[model samples]
Target: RFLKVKNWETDVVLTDTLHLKSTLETGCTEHICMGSIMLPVRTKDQLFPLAKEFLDQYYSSIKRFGSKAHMDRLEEVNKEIESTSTYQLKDTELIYGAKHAWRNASRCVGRIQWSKLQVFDARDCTTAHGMFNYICNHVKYATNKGNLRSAITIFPQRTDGKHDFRVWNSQLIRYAGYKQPDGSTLGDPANVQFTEICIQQGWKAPRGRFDVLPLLLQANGNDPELFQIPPELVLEVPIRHPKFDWFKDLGLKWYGLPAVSNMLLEIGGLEFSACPFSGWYMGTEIGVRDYCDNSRYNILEEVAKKMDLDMRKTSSLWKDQALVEINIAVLYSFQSDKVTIVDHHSATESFIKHMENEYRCRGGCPADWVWIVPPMSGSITPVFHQEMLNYRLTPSFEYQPDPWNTHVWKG
Candidate 1:
């Protein structure tokens, strides 16, 4: 939906949803710029082939790790599958699979630490209260005194065609959006729908730009439960310019950890819908997209105005100058606060090292060029010069339907 109108004495302004769904679409076609795979719920037999392929790959991984029990365990699991018509994995197997999925993820530029991921087993947590406790611990441990570590807390998987445990929040830390009287949102515009859902579920929406939304979790056959995050426990970096003291007066801040909660972890044809993972941010992700995107914070013009740049003309390069300074502020702020963050250039170099290391160990690495290239200054990075290929890989973090659309009907 879109609205367009003209001030009788002036000019027209436009308002609408930012991105349009393409007319050239299919049920199975992949999004051009996204990394996650989309899959529908399928019966066990229907997914058997993919499951069998994953099993063989799992056996190979175990064998390489010098596990002599691999063959026997595979046999037992195969027999159990044949009899019960369902497959189950041991916790150890799941841990290994999760790490391998991170390793196999084509879009993650920070896979250099794939093997070091801290996996928290939470399959037994079947209630929102338990999930809330687990998430608190996850954030605390991941954001340890400004020294961040990558971690994931895994909840139960789908079984017998029933969704068990699910998290409704897209990210553990996201700002709420309040729609104003003039059709503008005050906070994060991207989160307006989610913020509305939380309000409907009885959360008191705050009137701040960076107010973190509470965690919303739902177990089987239950309404969602909301839990407030302790403000003091969240590690935040206050954004400031390297040269200008006035930048700090903008009251800008961002969380130290980026924990994604809603994406599904798909391994061996099983989908764990409640696995929440966190990593330290790459500077451009925050500086360019989150803060500067037109439909989100939309702060470019403000920054340009504050910098005394000419915003009235495009050839003045005000947007470009403001963008670089925004990125500079992000990197400077994180480093000054001792929070772990990677500049895009350094991150791209690390990714190249990871790819080279993978080549010496395995064959060539799988990479998606669109994702591998940093948001800012693409032509200068090594990743921009490299050719890449992307394909579907199992044991991956996949995209799934929203819990509201899939598990609960809105209308």
Candidate 2:
């Protein structure tokens, strides 16, 4: 139900805006922009075919490498699958269900022996899945099914009700990935980690696809009611220390504390989904129209110059950051959402306060956001969505920054 929102978080992980914008511009036909928010969950939602043929021939390489033991793991997991009761069935589902597990990243190929990556190979995912299903089913068997039933029962309208992915995904990710012996951390790129696996499969990443897998994993699929805006999707602007050079001598001091920083985030919320019955079903609906209109992807750069920041001076940080003409695709988990306007909004307020309590930089986003959408043209999801049903929209959209403001989303 996160709709295209899931594709968004990848910006944080990959740190590429031009590529992100291009994903939007080129649109999510299948897998073009690996980690862009422009991707929709539906079309890319369905498995993008692992092209397993790559793995079939990988055995010889394994033998040459002294680590034929690595390939043995896949066989071990496969053998466990003989009995549905053994963890095998669940593991196979997740591994196969995985969008990409073997070779799915843009930069490298499979099993980077000691480089630090979670995805070991195609069936490594299967091993992870087997663990996931075992634990989740254990929870269902152990937890209060009474409370679980209350989800669609008493709180039939609750967005945060008993769900699967919220807590489950954390466990699954923690369980599935490789851990650093030295403790460095790495998340799969913002797009589908599985697709990275597919990419490693030696197939060209599809031409028009935008991967929205991150959002589905975060939002936890299956509830039409929760598609409303989130509590803290705020964009934060940086609070600079008064007396310092941004290029050379700045102490990185904000008000009083001295520290490091992430990009100055300007915040916004995706709350429109609260009113599920309204614009949700229309082929070219109002909610998405509004989402496109009031989003940072549409507004920030338009007002960059007026704010004294150079627009053309791109942050070497992200290639996708280039603000330019583009095509776009959107995806949402095929299921629905379970959001509550009051709770989500309140979460934003609480987080800001918590930051203040901790003396973190200024609270809320660095800027206020306003969305500007296109004037409605005849649209199709840039590609096709009938068979995929992952809610991946193929229709594309052009980008226009909505302009920036000083009035951040303060409580």
Candidate 3:
């Protein structure tokens, strides 16, 4: 992936305006093609020049084959060019394109081979047959492209010379000096020891990387799993002790705890809270969660109407806020009457930031702050703070089947 984003040498060629103008319009785009292993980039670029040079070297290689001469044979059947029924002629040629490629490709050859590097033992190495499978797959995928412009070619200048080459993601390539044997290959990039996927911008790594976890959410005091750890500004992705023996047997990297209970919210068809047991923070608002829930209760609609925010624009607006909400929960210290609490920002922020910077990971970023729980009963906004007397926490965590039942009780 990094290769796509970076600029490489000798990748472009334009002698004049004619080719330059059409380069983009006609230029082929690329994507990864692998058979067990991706075709080496070095060899795939040679299909163009070698094909052109092959024609030059052996003019007879283009002997009119198969259906090219069929029209000549049809001369007797055609009384006159326009006198002949065009429909009949077209019907006969309908499948001729495939037929022609079948005949012509037999004379063509552009497949590479690879070897097994058993550094540790024979068990780790790939067999010769396995290598050819990757090579043959490249040949099939590339040569079938229109004009046969896309192909696998050899690069003589590579460190491994005959073995160094790549299959083109698009367009044709021809290398200077020497021709490829019918079966010759160097190695595959997939087995190149390490792998990294990247974006074209280079500024941002793929979302599958580790960095995005921190930016996506912070703690809400609902999930027991998340509460096991202190809640604070989440700046890091979840991590575990390298020497933590508990994870070794299972081959798990870390045990993630979330700030909010996502399992309960997921029942409502929302993206805000993913897993309460995983210690992840929720990152959307009540408006979005309700709107997405297609249950019996049209609760999302009521929330929009009641809140009077633009319903359609709610999701985008929440995402653009790019803020994390920290939930501070009271934990009574048994030894004393005082309570000890942790800040949500630091605890969550560090792990999330590490996921971004150190791990180069990615995932969704918090669009807006979501209510980790639907709502607390009897809890009134600050504007009406002085009006109430019998203050007590409400039962906001009810499991109502109707999604629209988000009413705050007066009791």
Candidate 4:
């Protein structure tokens, strides 16, 4: 039903379905946000200037200059304060923070469009219902009818006195994983615990490998609530190999978006605990980590057998062959479905250019070569051989504490 991979050649023809706009849009023009081009700060010495930059952007966004309130807010930030201070940020600051957070993301190469992010501010949302509403908007906007856009929605920040607002789910979209008594699991192994939590929170765990989970939103100190994502809103590419029709029979698939929700967005030494952000997938991230990881899908041996490759000896190179085809299928499938994705080779090339761009713009680039290198064909990508500069940079997005501590995995 899909196009062949050998003949793929990065074709850009769209299906009729893709040409039509998804109904997920609210049709509201005001919610549509755009960011201006900007660069990441190179060092801590620029922190105050960066703060001033944000304050200036904030005032400019609202035309609020020369006012007592505006001057007072600026003066307040200009003075010394706690690194963990519970400060106020308006829509402009939140949007700017989201874009800069991506720029300061050490592992992401898509920082090339760091300033072009569509930032949604959901900090005013206090109830689970309101949180779910914003989550839906984030998904629909980010999904963008398979021509995905990098986006983030900032929820409430952690304050000095109040507990954090959080999304219990790691991502807005993820497949459910069900561990069985016989030691084999169904669906994504990575989500087994989260799936269990969802079921405990009153969700019916579907008996399948690729069932998308509901949004788990927790506002302020309230318990998390579950809300289902509309099926039409989620774009998933069904996995199929170009050479083997049996690949379709394997019934593998993945969600188009990778909106990471659990990470904390740190800006100007302040932490927004409930920010959820997304970037389009790099193929190996799914083909290698999700599909081939031993604890996850673990499909290599099965795939090798299906491909009629040898498994008897290490010399057969069965794993290597399986890995390549699996990655190929992933790239091929996404392309055929007209979803935005990057192959490892092209992804590495993009990263190299990203490194070059950042080097010229900021004098140096902070990159982790281990992470910069693609999972497949590591020796072939230029990033593998190149040295990378990695360091802690502020105005960054980082991992934070899970909302709850009593989870079986953590216990």
Candidate 5:
């Protein structure tokens, strides 16, 4: 009885949920949830098969499957791989693969705009300085003066499981986290280790709560170098609540772009270890996760105190009230500054539509329910109750080991 469902908005009834079972045999059982787990790396012997599979997917996408050109390209790729034990993607292939990777990303609720991604092919970038220049260009282009555009700048691929290009910073743009003398963190606590590494690398730490950390880029398996992002290029929005004037006095602000730099981009058995991709922010990402999360800025208590909420009682729902207001401030401030952002409500609704479209076009959409649901107001969102199956998909962005942890220093 629970299998059939109707669209609350469109009234288009889905007869059955069978279409969602496309990947049922993906090694996930009833007792385990493999939604957030990273797929294992392909072995050397498995590389050519995976490349051929992706090539087939590429040809199929263009409605040219089994055509002479497609077969010839496959043969060409196979020969190239046999000769060098690796293969290269053409520019057009890289562009399609990047967009496809975004579309296949299970954690993102913003896949509705996947096809609109602007891919910057910087595969020829050989030095850390060159990587820095390319990244600066990517930041400027994607920032677009606060009207953020979805984009990815791909650096050179990892060769023979060596010579990996890497962006040491987790995100292309993030605030410095200074370890205060009192054992408190001054900025984003999550970035404390990275900030310390930057200091050790001769970067001058400004010790400010909102100081943009310099980029630590490693090119061609070499020692990572530090490069500062131009202040003007990093557009930030000063957060202010529409109703509470004092909110602005909190000195709260956030960067406009959320470019994830550390994630590896896997395409057709090839790995681009330093592909920094970005989309506009979802308000709660800044308001709830960044600002209110205990490990982050931890501004909830302060906001609650300023609002004169009785902090002594859990019955007061002070935290909940404070969270809504902070989210309000985030959305309001971004809009006021003409920065691109989406509230959770609209974003989830779009995801629902995207899911429906995916089911109709493809057999299913891989979705992580835990991730798709907003951190705050989980039950209120449409995706909260929806049963989603998460599984691994190829040509995707994936978390890679921190370069420092995996790096071997020269003797």
Candidate 6:
């Protein structure tokens, strides 16, 4: 039934109806919904059919469906798989597949820039040292002196679900966390376990609040080797508020690049166990989640007290007030440092436009609403009201089991 409703921002009365019929069944009954969960791993027998399906999609994408070259390539892939049990993707195919994976990432809000991603094919990398060199180059190129660019560095793929290349660090750039004597964390708590692992692997722990963790590179299913990222190659912005000079005294800073290193990239049934991808940050990612999350830096109460808010009462909205200023500082700092960033409002608007474009092009856009909405001020954002369907698609990025949990070290 169509109903009259008022726009939250413009106060305009409009008629609308919920598109319940458009929703897809997500393997849930009335009592449960596992829409946000990860998909299962593909079995060995399921690979060839998936590869063939991807080739068909690729051919159709180039407007050469059923052409002589397309047929020849498909047959070549089939014969190669029959003989060797695996086939390699052409450079062009790898590039397109990487971008498609980004586009199909339901949790990402920056899909508007998916097609602009720079794909670095490092599949020829054989040693941990070679992996480190390629990673360093990727960091330098993507950082671009703070004018951040979206890019991915693809290492060699897993063969027989073993001998995989992997980056042990969750992110290419992250602060180390130390377990202090007082049972408190000194750096990013999210990385405490990883930091400890790095130390066990011969890393010298500096015990700083924002020390950049070293790269843990594992190649050919071997034990991970530690390599430090040169400080000169990392671009960090010292956060400061435009209106409050005292904000700089907090000794706060964040790296310009948000590169995720551990996620698995699956394309055409080929699994890339070590494809690190990066994009410029949305302001709230640093201001709200990194700084304000209770498990993270947990700086809200301190910032609120600095603002002289009445902390004794919950209705004082001190947290909300502090959040706004913190976000402002993040945006302002990144801008003043000439670093690329986007505010939540602008990012959300861009995502809505991207969603529209996707619907026009593909007839459906898979999105996880819990992730698409900004962490703070959810009700105020346009995406909060938009009904979205979450589903899995091929040429996608998937979370993999952490390498340490599954590895058996040879003594």
The predictions' CA RMSDs to the true structure, in order, are 10.5, 23.7, 29.6, 12.7, 2.9, 3.8
Candidate number with greatest TM-score: 5
Worst 10-residue lDDT window for candidate 2 reads 270-279
Candidate 6 lDDT over residue span 336-371, tens digit each: 999999999999888877876666577556778878
lDDT (tens digit, per residue) of candidate 4 on 1-411 = 221111022232221221121112222355652221122212334445656655664575567866777788777765643342335666667776677667767678556667779888887888888988898888899988899998888887766424567889998899999999998999999999888889988998777878999888877757778899989898889999999999989889999999999888877546688888888988898999899999989999899999999799979999999999898999999999999998878877777677666655554555555566677788787677665545445457777667666222211
Comparing 4 and 5 on TM-score, the stronger one: 5
Model 4 pairs whose backbones collide? none
Output the better candidate (3/5) by lDDT: 5
Q: State the lDDT of candidate 2 residue by residue for 1-411, as single tens digits.
A: 111111121221111121221111223346564233432211211111111222332333334333555345445533432322122222322222121221121111111211221111112212223323332332332223211110000001112222212211211111012223575322222223333433443434332322111111111223211111121221111212122223112111101110111111100100111100000112112112312233212322332332345445466422222111111111111011211111112223342233223222211111001111112321222111111011111111112111111112212
Candidate 1 lDDT tens digits, 1-411: 532322222232323221121111223445454444434255646556656666677777657432556556666666766677667778877888899778867789988889999999988887899999999999999999999999999988877546557789999998888889998889899888888889898898777888899888987536778999889778999999989898999888988899989888988777788899998999999999999999989889889989999888999999999999999999999999999999999998888778766655764456667788898899778777665545446678877778878665423
Cα error, residue 384 of model 6, in Å, equals 1.3
RMSD of candidate 6 to true structure, Å: 3.8
Model 6 TM-score on a 0 to 1 scale: 0.93
Instruction: Please identify which of the two predictions, 1 or 6, would achieve the higher lDDT against the true structure.
Output: 6
lDDT per residue for candidate 3 within 1-411, as digits (tens), equals 011111023232111111111111111225542212211111224322322222221222334333445334344223322342211222222122112221122111110000110011111113223322333343333323211222221111112222211211111111011112553211212111111111211213222211212111112211111011111321222211233333223221111121222112110011111111111222221112211233311233433343344556766553222111101111111112221112233323332232223113211111101111122211222111111011111101112121112212222
Point out the higher-scoring one by lDDT: 3 or 4.
4
TM-score of 5: 0.93
- For each candidate, the alpha-carbon lDDT, in order, equals 0.79, 0.20, 0.20, 0.74, 0.87, 0.87
Give the clashing pairs for model 5: none
Task: Give stretches of model 3 more than 4 Å off.
Answer: 1-277, 283-287, 290-298, 308-352, 356-411
Query: Could you arrange the candidates by TM-score from highest to lowest?
Result: 5, 6, 1, 4, 2, 3
